[PDB]
Amino acid sequence: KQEVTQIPAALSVPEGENLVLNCSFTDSAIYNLQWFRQDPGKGLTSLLLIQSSQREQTSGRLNASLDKSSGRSTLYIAASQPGDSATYLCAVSNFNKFYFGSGTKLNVKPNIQNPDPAVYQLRDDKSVCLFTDFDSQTNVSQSKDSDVYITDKCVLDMRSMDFKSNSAVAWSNKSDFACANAFNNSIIPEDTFFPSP
Amino acid sequence: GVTQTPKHLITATGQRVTLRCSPRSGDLSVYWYQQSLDQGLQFLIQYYNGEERAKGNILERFSAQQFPDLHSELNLSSLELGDSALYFCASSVATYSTDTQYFGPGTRLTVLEDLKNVFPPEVAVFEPSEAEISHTQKATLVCLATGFFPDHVELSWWVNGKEVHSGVCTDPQPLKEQPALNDSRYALSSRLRVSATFWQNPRNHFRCQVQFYGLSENDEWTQDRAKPVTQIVSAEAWGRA
Amino acid sequence: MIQRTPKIQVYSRHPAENGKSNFLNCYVSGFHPSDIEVDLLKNGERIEKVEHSDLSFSKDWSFYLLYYTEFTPTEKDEYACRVNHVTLSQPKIVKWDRDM
Amino acid sequence: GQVMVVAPR
Amino acid sequence: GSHSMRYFHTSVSRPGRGEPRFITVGYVDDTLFVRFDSDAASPREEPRAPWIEQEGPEYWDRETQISKAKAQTDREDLRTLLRYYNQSEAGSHTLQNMYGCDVGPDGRLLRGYHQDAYDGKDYIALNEDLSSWTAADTAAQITQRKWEAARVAEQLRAYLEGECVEWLRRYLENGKETLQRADPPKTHVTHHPIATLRCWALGFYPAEITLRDGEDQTQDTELVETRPAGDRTFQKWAAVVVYTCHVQHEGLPKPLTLRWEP
Ligand SMILES: *[C@@H]1O[C@H](CO)[C@@H](O)[C@H](O)[C@H]1NC(C)=O
Ligand SMILES: *[C@@H]1O[C@H](CO)[C@@H](O)[C@H](O)[C@H]1NC(C)=O
Ligand SMILES: *[C@@H]1O[C@H](CO)[C@@H](O)[C@H](O)[C@H]1NC(C)=O
Ligand SMILES: *[C@@H]1O[C@H](CO)[C@@H](O)[C@H](O)[C@H]1NC(C)=O
Numbered sequence: 001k002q003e004v005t006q007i008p009a010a011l012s013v014p015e016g017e018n019l020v021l022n023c024s025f026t027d028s029a030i031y032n033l034q035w036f037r038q039d040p041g042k043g044l045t046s047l048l049l050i051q052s053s054q055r056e057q058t059s060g061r062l063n064a065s066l067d068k069s070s071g072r073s074t075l076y077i078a079a080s081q082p083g084d085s086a087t088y089l090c091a092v093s094n095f096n097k098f099y100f101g102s103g104t105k106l107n108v109k110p111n112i113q114n115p116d117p118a119v120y121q122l123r124d125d126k127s128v129c130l131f132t133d134f135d136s137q138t139n140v141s142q143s144k145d146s147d148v149y150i151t152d153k154c155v156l157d158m159r160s161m162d163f164k165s166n167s168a169v170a171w172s173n174k175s176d177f178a179c180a181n182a183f184n185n186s187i188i189p190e191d192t193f194f195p196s197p
Numbered sequence: 198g199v200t201q202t203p204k205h206l207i208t209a210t211g212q213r214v215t216l217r218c219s220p221r222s223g224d225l226s227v228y229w230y231q232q233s234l235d236q237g238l239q240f241l242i243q244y245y246n247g248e249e250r251a252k253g254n255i256l257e258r259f260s261a262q263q264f265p266d267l268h269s270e271l272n273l274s275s276l277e278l279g280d281s282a283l284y285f286c287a288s289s290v291a292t293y294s295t296d297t298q299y300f301g302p303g304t305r306l307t308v309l310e311d312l313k314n315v316f317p318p319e320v321a322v323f324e325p326s327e328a329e330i331s332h333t334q335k336a337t338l339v340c341l342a343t344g345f346f347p348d349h350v351e352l353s354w355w356v357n358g359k360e361v362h363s364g365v366c367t368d369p370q371p372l373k374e375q376p377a378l379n380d381s382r383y384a385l386s387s388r389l390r391v392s393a394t395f396w397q398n399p400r401n402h403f404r405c406q407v408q409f410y411g412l413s414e415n416d417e418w419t420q421d422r423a424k425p426v427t428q429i430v431s432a433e434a435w436g437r438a
Numbered sequence: 439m440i441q442r443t444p445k446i447q448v449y450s451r452h453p454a455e456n457g458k459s460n461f462l463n464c465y466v467s468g469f470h471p472s473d474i475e476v477d478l479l480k481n482g483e484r485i486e487k488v489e490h491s492d493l494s495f496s497k498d499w500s501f502y503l504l505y506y507t508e509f510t511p512t513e514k515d516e517y518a519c520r521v522n523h524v525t526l527s528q529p530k531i532v533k534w535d536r537d538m
Numbered sequence: 539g540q541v542m543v544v545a546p547r
Numbered sequence: 548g549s550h551s552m553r554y555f556h557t558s559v560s561r562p563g564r565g566e567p568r569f570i571t572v573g574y575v576d577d578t579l580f581v582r583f584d585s586d587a588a589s590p591r592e593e594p595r596a597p598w599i600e601q602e603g604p605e606y607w608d609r610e611t612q613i614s615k616a617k618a619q620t621d622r623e624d625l626r627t628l629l630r631y632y633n634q635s636e637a638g639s640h641t642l643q644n645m646y647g648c649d650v651g652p653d654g655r656l657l658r659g660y661h662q663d664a665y666d667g668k669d670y671i672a673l674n675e676d677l678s679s680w681t682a683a684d685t686a687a688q689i690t691q692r693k694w695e696a697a698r699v700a701e702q703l704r705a706y707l708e709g710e711c712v713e714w715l716r717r718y719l720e721n722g723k724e725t726l727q728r729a730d731p732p733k734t735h736v737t738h739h740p741i742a743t744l745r746c747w748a749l750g751f752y753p754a755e756i757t758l759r760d761g762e763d764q765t766q767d768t769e770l771v772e773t774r775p776a777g778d779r780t781f782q783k784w785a786a787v788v789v790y791t792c793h794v795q796h797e798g799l800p801k802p803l804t805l806r807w808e809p
Contacts, residue, residue, distance in 0.1 A: 029609045031294035031542050040369065043199075043285060044300040051295060051698075052542045053705035089238065093294065095612045097253045098228075100238040116333060120326035128323045128339050130388075149372060151386050156366035158335075158390060167366065169339055169386040195328035293697035294544040439640075440667035451777045453749075465774040470667040471641055472559055491775075492582045492595075493570045494555050499643055499664045501557075506777050537737050538745070539606075539714035540554060540573070540613040541646070541706040545699045547624040547663075547671075547690040 002027040006090050006101035014109050014136060019077035021104045023090035028068040031093040035064050035075045037086040038103070044089065048075070080108045082155070082164075109136035110155060110164045118193035121179045129179035132167040134189060140168040141186040148172040148182065199288050199301035205349045205410035205427075206306045207315065208276055216271040216304050220288030226250070227269040228287035228298055229261055238285070244269060245292050273306070281308045307347045312412060314380045315425040318345035320407045322434040325396055336396035338434060340405035343374065343384040349410035354389045357402050364390040397438040404433040441525050442500050444469035446532045448519040454511045454536045462509045462534065464519035467502035471524065476505050479518040479531065485509075511536075549657065550576055550726075552715045553647035558621035562637045567625055569618035574647075575718045575726060577753045578779060583614040590615070598722030628665055631686035641666055646673075646703070648711035659707030663687070677704035729753065729798035730780065736792065736807040744807055746792035750780040757795045758785040 007022040023033070031052050036044040048057045050066040050073070057064050063076040077084060085108050090101035117134035121127070131140065134153075143150045150170045157164050170182040180194055200219045208214055220227050229241040240253035244263035255261075260272040273280055283305050287298040309315070320343075325336035342350060348371040354361045371383035387405065395401065411425040418424040445468040451461035466476055472493055478485040490505040509517070522529040556571040566585065572595075573581035580596035592610035594600045621642050629636060646661040662672035671680055671687040671694070678700055682688040694700065719726055732751035738744060748756055754773050769786040776782050785792065795802040 029542065029605075029612070031544065034297060036300075041302060043302050044287070046297040046299075049295075049297050051702035051705050053702060053709045055709070095616065097243075097251050098240045100230075100240070102237055118329065118332065120329045120337075122326055122337075122339055123324035124321065126321060126323075126341060126343070128341065128386075130326070130329070130337060130339060132329070132337060133333060146376070149374070149384060151368050151372065154366040154368060154388065156364050156388055156390050159363040163335075165390060167337065167388050167390075169341075169388070171341060171386075193328075193332060195326075195332070290697065291546055291693070292544055293546070293693075293699065294542065295699050295702045296697040442667070445772060447771060447774050449774065449782065461777050463774070463777055467772060467774075471639065472557060473639070492572050492579070492584065493557055494572050495557065495643055495645075499667050499669075504775050504777065537739070539710060540610055540617075541703065541710065542609075542613055542616075543699070543702055543706075544616060544620055545694060545697065546620055547627055547693075 002092065002094050002099045004090055004092055004099045004101040006088075006104055008104055009102060010105045010107075012107045012109065013080060015080060015082055015111055017080050017108075019075075019080050019106070021075040021077065021088050021106075023073040023075070023101055025071045025073070025090075025092050025099070027092075027094055028071050029094060030068065033064075033066050033073050034091040034093075035062070035073075036089040036091055037084075038089055039086050046091075047088075077106075080106075082108045082110045082157075084108050110157075112136055112164070112166065115189070116193065117189045117191065118195070119179045119183060120195065125173040126171050127177065129170040129182040130167060131170070131183045131186075131188070132165060134166050134192075136166065138166070138189060139187060140183070143170070144185050145172075145174075147174040148177065150183065150185075199286055199299055201284075201286050201301040201304050203304060204302070206304060207312070207347065207349060207411060207413075208306065208308055209312055210276060210278065210308060210310060212276050212308075213272065213274040214276065214306060216273070216284055216286075216306075218269045218271070218286035218288075218301060220267055220269070220286075221299055223290065224288035224299070225267060225291050226289045227263055227267070228289070229255075229269070229271050230285040230287065231282050232285060232303075233279075233282040241271075250292065276308045278308050278310065281306055305349065307349060309347070312416065312418075312425075313420060314346055315411050316344055316346045316382055317409050317411060317425050317428055318342040318350060318385075318407055318430050320405055320430045320432045322403065322405050322432040324434055324437075330393045330396065334393045336391050336393050338389045338391070338396075338403055338405075340387045340389070340407075340432065341384065342386075342405075342407045342430070344382050345371075345384075345409060346380065346382045348383045348385075350383075350385060351408040351410075352385060352387045353406045353408070354387070355402075355404045355406055356389075356391075361389065364388075396436050398436045399438065401436040402433065403435065404431055406431045440470055442468055442470040443525040444474065444521055444523050446519065446521050446530060448517070448532045448534045449538075450511070450534070450536070451506070456512050457510070460509060460511050462507050462511075462517055464505045464521070464532075465502070466505070466521055467496075468500045469502075469523055469525070470500055472501045473524070474501075474503070475520075475522040475529075476503065477520040478505060478507055479520055480509075481516060482518075484520075548652045549649060550715060550719055551647055551649045552711060552718065553645060553660075556617060556621070556642075556644040558618065558625060558642040560625045560638075560640050562639060567618070567622055569614070569621060571614055571617065575715070575722070577781075578722075578726060580718070581610065583611070585618055596722065596725075598718065598725065601721060628686065631689060643667075646707070648707045648715065650712050650715055654712060654716050656708050656712050659704070659711070661703050661707070673700060673703055677707060725779075729796075731796055731798035731800075732756065732794070734794060734803065734805050736805055738807060742789055743786050744789060744792075745784050745786045746794070746805060747782075747784045748794060748796075749782045750776060750778075751796055751798060752780055753797065754781045755797065756781065756783050758783060758793065759790055763793070764790075 087103040115135040232238040243251035367387035371385040373381040375381040447465040517534040560567040569585040643664040649657040663670035669683040680691040730752040732748035
């Protein structure tokens with residue numbers, strides 16, 4: 001029947017980059033082609049609706065094309081912003097029903113002008129470490145010990161100061177666990193501040 | 198906008214669930230979708246002015262209708278583990294091929310073999326580091342919800358009885374505490390970054406709230422431990438110079 | 439709701455030559471609504487082997503239809519066309535004159 | 539070729 | 548030098564007898580080439596010209612589902628217009644639709660069309676700019692507001708400017724032997740004592756035909772509407788009660804003026 005494929009599956013890019021999100025469909029007898037964005041908890045939100053006989057649509061930084069003769073569509077995202085981080089779904093409408101694609105999970109990394117990477121022990125059988133204030137290109141890798149849990153990077157936005165910060169949390173209900181060796185398995189920056197009493 | 202009830206739904210095999218949807222006022226057409234990992238977002242059925250108009254790969258155990266007030270209902274009977282997915286409801290003004298659909302928040306359904314492994318989360322708040330306060334001139338609190346199953350959790354921060362979203366970032370997906378076991382419980386961590394001076398203020402109340410969706414009040418429970426009902430487990434911390 | 443009276447034209451496809459095969463046409467146009475009854479008459483009797491084109495209309499929205507039948511014109515056989523529409527007080531029978 | 543459109547009145 | 552593609556649709560409700568009758572035809576200039584009748588056992592878009600039979604199965608499957616969807620929508624509109632005009636569900640009503648595009652010698656768009664008719668009277672029509680509507684009554688203004696809210700004209704405009712002229716260039720190149728070649732008429736004059744003089748023109752394509760001492764007798768002339776011969780040609784005559792006849796056509800090298808040879 002109608003097979004909708006999307007390329008790429010995921011996309012983690014620095015902010016400001018122009019993005020190319022592709023969509024392919026096998027049945028060209030379509031009433032329209034839509035590009036949705038899905039956000040956790042909010043649902044699908046239609047960004048562009050290319051009509052059956054239209055070859056492109058445009059909405060601000062979004063510019064999508066349509067080529068039914070080849071079964072292709074491309075969503076161009078100019079100057080990607082962190083607020084654009086979502087799953088971008090290619091939707092198509094045929095005679096019988098509607099079809100959706102796998103989607104492109106987008107994560108737009110905000111730029112950290114001057115990072116200050118550091119590891120901190122937080123007060124309080126759990127005890128928590130915090131790798132924070134590092135640049136958006138620092139890869140926080142998983143632990144070599146399954147008794148040590150390490151979450152992925154997570155960007156908080158302090159709106160009142162326009163200060164965005166990366167942070168990763170580690171904890172372990174195991175003795176001999178320290179924060180100086182908590183994130184030992186990641187390529188941590190050399191200028192990482194390690195406070196020690 | 199389109200509203201869907203209930204938000205979450207924990208159920209067992211063989212049970213039956215009724216999903217509801219109120220389309221946008223004035224919209225005549227309603228749509229039902231199912232979003233899984235193996236099949237993605239699948240179109241199920243469409244109604245227009247009360248009449249069924251389109252049908253995807255909807256199963257025989259799935260029953261739907263559109264009422265005269267234009268609101269819809271979706272019944273999933275003889276539930277199976279494979280029915281665990283997110284069910285979305287969309288609505289359009291009519292059946293125009295030139296117009297779009299308007300989706301709701303969705304209803305997440307989780308079907309389990311038995312409800313014996315449902316557990317509420319233990320949440321905790323870890324106070325900011327003195328080194329970080331002196332080094333970065335700001336303070337980070339971290340909340341850890343641990344030991345819950347399934348991953349039906351919603352973490353929020355409340356600075357003095359007001360839900361904060363600035364400086365707040367939460368893990369997008371929970372992590373398995375024992376990724377070697379199948380029915381492994383989950384853990385989740387969130388961060389609230391306040392100012393170093395804002396944390397030294399003792400009259401500030403910081404509270405991590407974790408809404409957990411477990412069993413309902415009407416659900417059966419024969420186990421000797423406490424009923425893992427849909428509950429809210431909270432942990433709090435107060436400012437200190 | 440408008441009602442238009444049909445314009446009946448019974449004629450031949452090619453010039454009428456007795457003996458050679460031909461097609462007898464009864465062109466009905468300029469009528470509304472579309473429901474209409476057109477029977478081709480052979481010496482008064484009705485012709486059962488009658489084809490007709492698909493319903494279409496003009497810029498003024500009036501419908502037009504072309505009924506046709508492969509026949510052999512002769513000097514002995516006399517043909518006609520019975521058209522019946524809601525605008526007709528009595529069904530109109532138009533004769534096929536060779537030179538009209 | 540016809541246009542693919544569903545536009546109820 | 549100009550060319551056109553048109554589609555005509557007719558939906559007639561049959562109360563108590565089943566679903567409405569849906570008949571649609573397609574024309575390239577004055578040449579029929581597709582049809583669809585809902586009163587067929589297995590209704591499907593069918594060829595009516597040699598040059599359209601070359602199209603593959605994905606062409607006919609798509610054109611058939613466009614006609615089946617158009618009949619479905621017209622069935623809803625016939626019931627909807629009963630609500631608009633407060634009419635009884637026991638009366639028959641007609642919905643006529645016509646859309647198409649005109650091109651010149653370069654193949655570029657000259658004029659696009661899309662207009663409705665309910666019971667022989669105009670309903671809603673797409674203006675020449677392909678972005679606004681003209682409603683003939685307050686009921687069509689309901690449809691206009693819906694079609695403006697749903698951005699219906701933006702797709703019709705995209706079709707008329709895009710797919711319509713692109714489909715038209717394809718049909719002109721495939722059936723060039725029958726479409727891009729005109730046929731002049733065969734003329735003669737007859738006499739019928741009452742006396743009348745009938746100026747004939749037979750077997751010409753396209754249907755555009757135009758019939759004392761250099762002056763015109765435009766009021767004493769009976770001009771019958773151009774009629775199809777059946778073999779994709781046309782006929783027409785003019786009579787005057789009694790003197791020369793005037794004849795022009797595309798396929799004619801020069802406008803002939805005939806006289807009654809005894
Ligand atoms: C995506 O589409 C663009 C434009 O159609 C094409 O140039 C490119 O090769 C495609 N594939 C990619 C970007 O992987
Ligand atoms: C969208 O992008 C295409 C090329 O990819 C360009 O030709 C077109 O002008 C763009 N649309 C705008 C800028 O509105
Ligand atoms: C330090 O990092 C290395 C990385 O290979 C790791 O093997 C080692 O266990 C870490 N140290 C501790 C004490 O965990
Ligand atoms: C769904 O189930 C409820 C409760 O059994 C019932 O009242 C309702 O009619 C059902 N709806 C459908 C569409 O089956």
